[PDB]
Amino acid sequence: RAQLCQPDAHGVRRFNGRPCASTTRYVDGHKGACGCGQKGSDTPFPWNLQKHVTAPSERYFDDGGSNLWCGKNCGKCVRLTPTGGFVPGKGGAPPNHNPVVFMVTNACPINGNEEWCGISGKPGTNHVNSHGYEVHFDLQDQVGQVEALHWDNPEVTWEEVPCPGDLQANYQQCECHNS
Numbered sequence: 001r002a003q004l005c006q007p008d009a010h011g012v013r014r015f016n017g018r019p020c021a022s023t024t025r026y027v028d029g030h031k032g033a034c035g036c037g038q039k040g041s042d043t044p045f046p047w048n049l050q051k052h053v054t055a056p057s058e059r060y061f062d063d064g065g066s067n068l069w070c071g072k073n074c075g076k077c078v079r080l081t082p083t084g085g086f087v088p089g090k091g092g093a094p095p096n097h098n099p100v101v102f103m104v105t106n107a108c109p110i111n112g113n114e115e116w117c118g119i120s121g122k123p124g125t126n127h128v129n130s131h132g133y134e135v136h137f138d139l140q141d142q143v144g145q146v147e148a149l150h151w152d153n154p155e156v157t158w159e160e161v162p163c164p165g166d167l168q169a170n171y172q173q174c175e176c177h178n179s
C-alpha cells in the first residue's frame with residue numbers, strides 16, 4: 001500500500017478529509033500555456049523555469065474546459081503537502097513532508113499524458129486519473145528545483161492558496177494576466 005490516500009465512495013483519493021493529487025516533474029523549455037514569457041516568442045521568463053511552478057492536468061487548468069492558452073486557473077497557486085505516499089514503481093517516499101506552494105503557469109494536456117493527466121472532469125466531479133487522483137500537478141524542474149525538494153512523484157494533498165507576493169508579481173507579466 002504505497003498510496004496512502006484512500007479512494008472514497010466515488011473513487012476520489014483523499015487523506016484526512018483533504019483531496020489528494022499525484023505529481024510528476026517535467027522539463028521542456030517552453031514558455032507555456034499561461035504566456036509567462038515575452039509575447040509572441042516561445043521563451044519563458046527565467047523565473048518560470050526557476051521557481052515553484054506547475055502544469056496541472058487540463059481539466060483543472062481550464063476549470064472544466066479544454067483551452068490550452070490562458071486557462072481559467074492560470075496564475076492560481078496551490079499548496080502541495082506530501083503524505084508519504086507514491087504510486088508503486090512510479091515514485092518514492094520523500095525525505096520530509098514540508099509543504100510547497102506552486103503557481104500554475106502551464107498545462108498538462110490529456111493528449112500525450114494519459115496516465116497522469118487523463119482526467120475527464122474538473123475537481124469536484126469525481127473524475128480521476130489512472131491512479132485514482134482528481135487532479136495531477138506536473139512540476140517544472142528545469143533548474144533542479146524539484147530535485148532540491150527530493151520529491152520523486154510524491155502523493156500530496158492539495159489546496160488553492162493566495163499566491164506569495166513574489167509569485168503574484170511574476171504572474172503580472174504573463175500574457176494571460178487579465179485575459
Ligand SMILES: OC[C@H]1O[C@@H](O[C@H]2[C@H](O)[C@@H](O)[C@H](O)O[C@@H]2CO)[C@H](O)[C@@H](O)[C@@H]1O
Nearest residue numbers: 024025026027089090091113116138153
Ligand atoms: O505525463 C506527465 C509527465 O510524466 C513525466 O514522467 C514521469 C513518469 O510518467 C513516471 O513513470 C516516472 O516515475 O516519473 C516521471 C517523472 O515525473 C515526464 O517527465 C513529463 O515530461 C510528463 O509531462
Ligand SMILES: OC[C@H]1O[C@@H](O[C@H]2[C@H](O)[C@@H](O)[C@H](O)O[C@@H]2CO)[C@H](O)[C@@H](O)[C@@H]1O
Nearest residue numbers: 028030031032033042068069106107109
Ligand atoms: O509555449 C507557448 C505555448 O504553450 C502551449 O502549451 C503547451 C506548453 O508549451 C507545453 O510546455 C506543455 O507541455 O503543453 C502545453 C499544452 O499543449 C499553449 O497551448 C500554446 O497556446 C502556447 O503558444
